Amino acid sequence: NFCLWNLQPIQGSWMGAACIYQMPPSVRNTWWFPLLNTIPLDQYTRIYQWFMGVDRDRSGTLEINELMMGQFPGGIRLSPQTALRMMRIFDTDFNGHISFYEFMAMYKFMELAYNLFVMNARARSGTLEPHEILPALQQLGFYINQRTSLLLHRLFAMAFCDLNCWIAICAFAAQTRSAYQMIFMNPYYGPMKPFNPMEFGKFLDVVTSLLE
Amino acid sequence: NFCLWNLQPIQGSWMGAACIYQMPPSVRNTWWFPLLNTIPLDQYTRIYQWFMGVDRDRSGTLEINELMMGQFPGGIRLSPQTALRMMRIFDTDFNGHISFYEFMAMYKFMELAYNLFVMNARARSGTLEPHEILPALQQLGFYINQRTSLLLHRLFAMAFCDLNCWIAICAFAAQTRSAYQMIFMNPYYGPMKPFNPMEFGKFLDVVTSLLE
Ligand SMILES: [Ca+2]
Numbered sequence: 001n002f003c004l005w006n007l008q009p010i011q012g013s014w015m016g017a018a019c020i021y022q023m024p025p026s027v028r029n030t031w032w033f034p035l036l037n038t039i040p041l042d043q044y045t046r047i048y049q050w051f052m053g054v055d056r057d058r059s060g061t062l063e064i065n066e067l068m069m070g071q072f073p074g075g076i077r078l079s080p081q082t083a084l085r086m087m088r089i090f091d092t093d094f095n096g097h098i099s100f101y102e103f104m105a106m107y108k109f110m111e112l113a114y115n116l117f118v119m120n121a122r123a124r125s126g127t128l129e130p131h132e133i134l135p136a137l138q139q140l141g142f143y144i145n146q147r148t149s150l151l152l153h154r155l156f157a158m159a160f161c162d163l164n165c166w167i168a169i170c171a172f173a174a175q176t177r178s179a180y181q182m183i184f185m186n187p188y189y190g191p192m193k194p195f196n197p198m199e200f201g202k203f204l205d206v207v208t209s210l211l212e
Numbered sequence: 213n214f215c216l217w218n219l220q221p222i223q224g225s226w227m228g229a230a231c232i233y234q235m236p237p238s239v240r241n242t243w244w245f246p247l248l249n250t251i252p253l254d255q256y257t258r259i260y261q262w263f264m265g266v267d268r269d270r271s272g273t274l275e276i277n278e279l280m281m282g283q284f285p286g287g288i289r290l291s292p293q294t295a296l297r298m299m300r301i302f303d304t305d306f307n308g309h310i311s312f313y314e315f316m317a318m319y320k321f322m323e324l325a326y327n328l329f330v331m332n333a334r335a336r337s338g339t340l341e342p343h344e345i346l347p348a349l350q351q352l353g354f355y356i357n358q359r360t361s362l363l364l365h366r367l368f369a370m371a372f373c374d375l376n377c378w379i380a381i382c383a384f385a386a387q388t389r390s391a392y393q394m395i396f397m398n399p400y401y402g403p404m405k406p407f408n409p410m411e412f413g414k415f416l417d418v419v420t421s422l423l424e
């Protein structure tokens with residue numbers, strides 16, 4: 001674009017650098033870090049108010065019990081299992097707590113997932129039928145096959161998969177992205193190839209099949 | 213060894229070549245193929261008699277229902293889930309049936325697993341306590357960590373893990389070895405490194421964590 005009245009922000013704007021440079025290196029290094037630059041200051045402040053309502057001991061961090069007990073936007077609730085998946089995605093320094101910055105990324109992740117649920121729940125409001133899982137995951141960036149989409153519905157759902165079970169699926173897919181990073185950072189496998197979503201999709205198909 | 217009275221068979225003896233060359237390429241190419249050369253002709257014949265007792269429709273192949281319904285040595289029974297894991301390991305041409313040769317490898321796999329169960333069930337006969345899983349898996353070639361061993365017990369077991377649940381664990385570990393082969397055969401990852409058990413052990417630890 002060259003129009004002065006419609007200029008778009010650039011990735012890596014100098015105006016954000018100082019903040020980014022002060023962030024913990026574990027957070028900056030994660031695959032999901034770009035979520036944080038999708039959040040405007042007004043939403044940062046709403047998210048903080050949400051955080052304060054889930055932060056039962058005013059520690060300024062969330063522990064898995066607070067995730068298990070918390071309510072999230074859109075009525076989302078996290079089972080003990082899904083809460084652990086969220087910890088394994090977002091607790092980037094493996095110390096058993098999620099910081100505010102890690103929670104912001106989790107919140108935005110859930111918002112994206114929520115949006116895709118509502119956009120893809122076409123057959124029956126409030127649920128995803130098995131055939132609706134595939135397009136919703138693809139739109140999120142998870143390029144799986146049909147067999148995988150039906151398996152995910154079966155494992156995480158009932159004939160219908162509600163919002164909470166969808167969040168659980170998305171958490172599994174994201175936790176598998178973190179796993180891929182952990183596996184392939186091992187220098188045994190040589191220099192890490194750039195991320196290819198189609199190739200990661202095959203990895204996700206293989207890993208999902210191990211859940212039965 | 214140079215003693216004439218104690219000569220050992222060599223891997224790849226010319227005497228076996230003709231048989232090997234007539235085997236389906238999918239069977240020859242599997243990671244578990246070396247199991248087949250551990251079986252003497254007398255045992256081949258016992259295994260065939262076992263096979264005939266599980267082969268309900270005399271097809272000369274076993275389908276998942278026959279695995280679900282069959283009894284195996286040592287009293288082993290396969291749940292529907294474990295039977296599917298056995299199919300995913302041993303049905304090397306993905307046609308929904310296990311041949312006699314694929315069953316022979318499965319049988320020997322179960323025998324190895326059985327032996328290690330009895331050798332490692334020291335605290336209480338008939339069960340493995342969580343601390344006993346680690347040494348038994350290591351002896352089989354699965355170099356996992358403590359956290360993983362406790363997770364496997366929890367997922368597949370109760371305070372005690374019986375023989376059937378141990379077979380299920382071993383099946384999961386073996387199915388993950390097959391997954392690793394599938395993933396890393398993808399030429400995106402470049403030429404496949406030689407198999408390293410310690411490195412695969414890390415892969416198994418990461419993948420196990422995705423089961424919660
Ligand atoms: Ca707290």
Ligand SMILES: [Ca+2]
Binds near residue numbers: 091096
């Ligand atoms: Ca943390």
Ligand SMILES: [Ca+2]
Binds near residue numbers: 267271272274278
């Ligand atoms: Ca049959």
Ligand SMILES: [Ca+2]
Binds near residue numbers: 303304306308310
């Ligand atoms: Ca087959």
